[model samples]
Target: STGSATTTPIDSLDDAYITPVQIGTPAQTLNLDFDTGSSDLWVFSSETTASEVDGQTIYTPSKSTTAKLLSGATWSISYGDGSSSSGDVYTDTVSVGGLTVTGQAVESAKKVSSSFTEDSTIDGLLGLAFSTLNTVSPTQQKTFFDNAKASLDSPVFTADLGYHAPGTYNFGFIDTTAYTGSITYTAVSTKQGFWEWTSTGYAVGSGTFKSTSIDGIADTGTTLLYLPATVVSAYWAQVSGAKSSSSVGGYVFPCSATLPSFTFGVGSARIVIPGDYIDFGPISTGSSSCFGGIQSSAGIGINIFGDVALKAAFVVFNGATTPTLGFASK
Candidate 1:
């Protein structure tokens, strides 16, 4: 079996992507962020405190006849962005696009951080990372992808993200028409519970490619691309009036300044992110200074190829026994 779903950016800056998910017997649909960096399908639900919820929709398990509580099970997770949530667990029928899975562990949020509460565009998150990263206690549960992989036509899911536009997520089969040129496959390190891989190197704009290995995770949950400080410095040097600002929180430059495109290697293939993509957005409303899409990962400990890079290429999360990642120009 296969499924196809539309994933849309929450805002013009592409802060996060959300896809509609059907939960329980009568199908209570809620828009959820399909996060590839974490494991645990959690949602804002009836069990959540009234003060914790804003305008976001909630999943009411008690209203679904098929929903069953996973007694003694609990989960809690914190993200790199500092947002966190904790809740009880329930097993229920869940569907994404046309694909359905019975007894899918649906974490019902009892509490959420202020950041999540304020963001009403997304009701929750559906994790696509390795099941080993699941935060459930007592007994760990498999992710939706893990449970549905067996019956899928192929053990693969593809992310075709777009810039300021809607993208498609296809499961079970790769859509050849979705990408151009041949795909370049690379080994993945699931030991880290992420889609982690090493890129051959990177180049700033029309500069020569640097021959070095840059290891990082392809994280859809993150908003920006994070690389080594040296690489980030090189990219910023090309732009006039650019500098790292402690007050601004990252490298920022005049919004009107011309920015250089960033290119990274996947095997012999070169994926180029447009200059406009790197000009993330203004630091504040009507501010002339804009935060860069690419920043230093030194503080983060690990580099992250987030939405900024993913939106520039077609990414395939191949879930074979020996998992691998495939990248292609779109």
Candidate 2:
């Protein structure tokens, strides 16, 4: 059966999108970050030391008749942004939109990093990434999508991340009305447990499209677009007052600085991220400087076509055959 869920941006920053998910027997509702880059359905819970949890809501399995603790099993995970969480496991019914997956492994944290503990909005993360990336210990967990895909009419999910607006995430079926024109599809390499694909090349602004190959992952969880160091440098050089800042930890430029459009090559499809979207708002509140949403991927190891880039178009994570990624204007 097909199901869909609404996604709302966390802030005007456009950093992350949060959606509602149902967990446990009585169906306790929680808001989760639907992260395709990660595969752990973790939540703050009673298992967590009360001191470790802040204003966020917690899931208590004891109240759910369908919840079964998987004793001796534990989980620990760290993110690229230095955030982390560790906890015990439980099997319960987890539902997204109108689709339900019975006995899904749900990781309820007993401990969380300051980053997670401090974020008051999201109660947890509903991982939509490949199951191979799950972090449960002793026995790894299967993602909600993995557990639900077999029964789906088509093994696919579409992410319609909007620009400064609410979007929809559709599962099992494509909403032809949500996108315009034809969708360009490209094969994906799941060897790295990511929707990794290579673009034929790219270009900065209205410059010529370079034929150099760029391999990257489509990560909805990440806020900014990350490219190779040299490529990032080249783009910044075009800005009048852009500089790599030691204090800000990335490239920063004047708030009013004009930016060039960033385009990616997917087969013959040219996905362009407009110049205004390239400016990732301000670096700090009340500051007359901003950070480039496009940054060097040198430290992160892999290129990330994060939310900043994804919001420019409608994306499809096709699992019907070989994994494929399809993109079209929203």
Candidate 3:
């Protein structure tokens, strides 16, 4: 048997994908960001400050008779973007897609950063990373996927992040129809709590595919694609009027600037990112400048293949003993 859900765009950010999830006994629905980058299933709840929550749908545990506090259990999380949340833990019924998990550890956020507080649509974060990366204290928490693994037909989930469009996430089953051509598989090195892998190298437009290996991660929560500084500079050099912007914090080019396609190699497979998608959007509404979706990953140890890159292809997150990332064209 398999379970599946649809993913929708998050405003102009176009960076992260969200799906609906049900929690507690009475099933309070929450719009959750299915982030493979982190490992904590945290949500805004009754514990959250009333003033902090804007238009978000809060999860109330007290209303659910099945909700039970995990005495002294707590969780705190900080994202790469500096957004954070901390709160107590409760064991409750959690449902995603058509699947349900009993006694799932649900982190109820009592505090959130300005970034999260301002983004009212995101009710919580559903972490899809390995259980080893969970944040629950006293006793480590298991992810929804981990808890549902035994009941699943297969221990796997696939991310079909569409290009500026709605997509589907299938759990425990691979829907071959969602992708065309062939799905090429590359081994994943699950170190540092990420789907880390080495790209055989990357190229700009029809440029040569260099063999320079790059260690990077596949992150769904992140909005833009990040490569090494040198590579990013090289790519931007091809775009007229493109330059490193100190004020904007990355590479920015004229809104009318045309960009070349970017490609990354996963083993022998060449996954291409279109030029249009690289434009990201205007740096700010009504601004004549646009931010490059592909930027420098310097300072950060590994490159990040964020939504800009992921949306171009179909991705399979295989939770096997030797995990692998299977990619194919849409």
Candidate 1, residues 1-330, lDDT tens digits: the string is 999999999999999999999999899999999999999999999999999999999999999999999999999999998899999999999998899999999999999999999999999999999999999999999999999999899999999999999999888999999999999999899988999999999999899999889999999999899999999999999999999999978899999998899999998899999999887778999899999999999889899999999999999999999999999999
| Candidate that would win on lDDT | 1
Clash count for each candidate, listed in order shown: 0, 0, 0
Which stretches of model 2 miss by more than 4 angstroms? none
What is the TM-score of each predicted model, taking all chains together? Answer: 0.99, 0.97, 0.97
For model 1, which pairs clash? none
Q: After superposition on all CA atoms, what RMSD does each candidate show versus the true structure?
A: 0.7, 1.2, 1.1
Q: Whose TM-score is higher: candidate 1's or candidate 3's? A: 1
Q: What's the ranking of the predictions by TM-score, best on top?
A: 1, 3, 2
**Residue 303: error of model 2 in Å?**
0.7
Could you tell me the lDDT of residue 209 within candidate 1? Answer: 96
Q: What is candidate 2's local distance difference test score? A: 0.89
Q: Candidate 3: where is the Cα deviation over 4 Å?
A: none
lDDT of 3 at 326: 86
Model 3 CA lDDT for position 115? 92
lDDT of each: 0.95, 0.89, 0.89
